[PDB]
UniProtKB/Swiss-Prot annotation:
It comes from Mycobacterium tuberculosis (strain ATCC 25618 / H37Rv). Inhibited by the amidino-urea compound 1-[(2,6-diethylphenyl)-3-N-ethylcarbamimodoyl]urea (compound 8918). It acts by binding to the phosphopantetheine pocket in the active site. Inhibition by compound 8918 kills M.tuberculosis. One of its GO terms (molecular function) is magnesium ion binding. One of its GO terms (biological process) is siderophore metabolic process. Coiled coil: none annotated. Belongs to the P-Pant transferase superfamily. Transfers the 4'-phosphopantetheine moiety from coenzyme A to a Ser of acyl-carrier-protein. Involved in post-translational modification of various type-I polyketide synthases required for the formation of both mycolic acids and lipid virulence factors. Acts on Pks13, Mas, PpsA, PpsB, PpsC and PpsD. Also acts on AcpM, the meromycolate extension acyl carrier protein. In addition, is involved in the activation of the acyl carrier protein MbtL and the nonribosomal peptides synthases MbtB and MbtE, which are involved in the biosynthesis of the siderophore mycobactin. Required for the replication and survival of Mycobacterium during the acute and chronic phases of infection in mice. CoA binds at R46, R54, K73, G74, D75, K76, T90, H91, D112, E155, K159, L169. It is an enzyme of class 2 (transferase). The keyword Transferase applies. This is 4'-phosphopantetheinyl transferase PptT.
Amino acid sequence: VGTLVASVLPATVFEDLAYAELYSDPPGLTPLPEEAPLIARSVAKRRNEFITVRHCARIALDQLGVPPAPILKGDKGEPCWPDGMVGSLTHCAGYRGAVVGRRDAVRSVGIDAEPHDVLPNGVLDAISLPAERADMPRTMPAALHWDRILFCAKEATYKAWFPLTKRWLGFEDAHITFETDSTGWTGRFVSRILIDGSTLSGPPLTTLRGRWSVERGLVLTAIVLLEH
Ligand SMILES: CC(C)(COP(=O)(O)OP(=O)(O)OC[C@H]1O[C@@H](n2cnc3c(N)ncnc32)[C@H](O)[C@@H]1OP(=O)(O)O)[C@@H](O)C(=O)NCCC(=O)NCCS
C-alpha cells in the first residue's frame, strides 16, 4: 500500500500533512546536483538511501502543493525545509519515509523507523531511565520488543525537538510513558522533557505526544506538534 506510516499519524491535522514511503532503493536514481555535495564522501549504502529518502520528501511536499526543489542540510544534520513547511525523514532496513506538514497547522514533526528486533542490554541502560525499564513491561504486550520501541520514540522525540530548540537532548533528558491499544500492535506515548524546554519561538517544550505501531517487522513512531 505504501501507507504504513499512516498508522502513527493524527486525524486532527491530517489535511495539513503528507507522507511518502518506499521499502527499497529504486535502481539508478540520480542525486539532484545541489544535493550531491551532501553525500560526496559517503559510502554507497548511505548514498542510495539518502537519495531515496529525499525523493520521498519531494513526493510528500508535492502533495501539499510545494514545487519540487533541493532540500539541503543545516545545523547538526537537520533537513532545510521550504518556507512554510516542517517535516521529518527516516530510514532503516526495508524502509524509507518522509512526513511533512504545513507550518501554519504543524509546529514540528519527528518520525523514526526501526526493525522490530531486540537491542543489546548494554545499549538499553544507555538509552533508558530506570523508571522506563520498570514501566514498559507493565504497559506493553509480552510479544513486543519494548526496548526497541522505546528507542524508536526517543529518536522521534529528538527529531521533533531539535528544530524548535537547536539544543541537544540526551536519552536521559526525556521520560517516555507508553500505552497500548487493545489490538496490541499500536498505541500512544508521551515524552516528558526533563530539562529546560525553551524554544526559538512559541511556548517551551514540556511534553511531546506521539504514536507508535509495529507492523511488517517494523516499528514506526511519529510526533506531530500542533500550532496553537
Ligand atoms: C539524529 C538521529 C536522531 C537520527 O536518527 P537515526 O535513527 O540515526 O537515522 P534516521 O534515518 O531515522 O534519521 C536520519 C535523518 O534524521 C534527520 N536529522 C538528522 N539530524 C537531525 C536533527 N539534528 N534534527 C532533526 N532531524 C535530523 C535527517 O533528515 C536524517 O536523514 P538525512 O541525513 O538523509 O537528511 C540519531 O542519529 C542521533 O544522533 N540521535 C541522538 C540524539 C537522540 O536520539 N537523543 C534522544 C532524545 S530523547
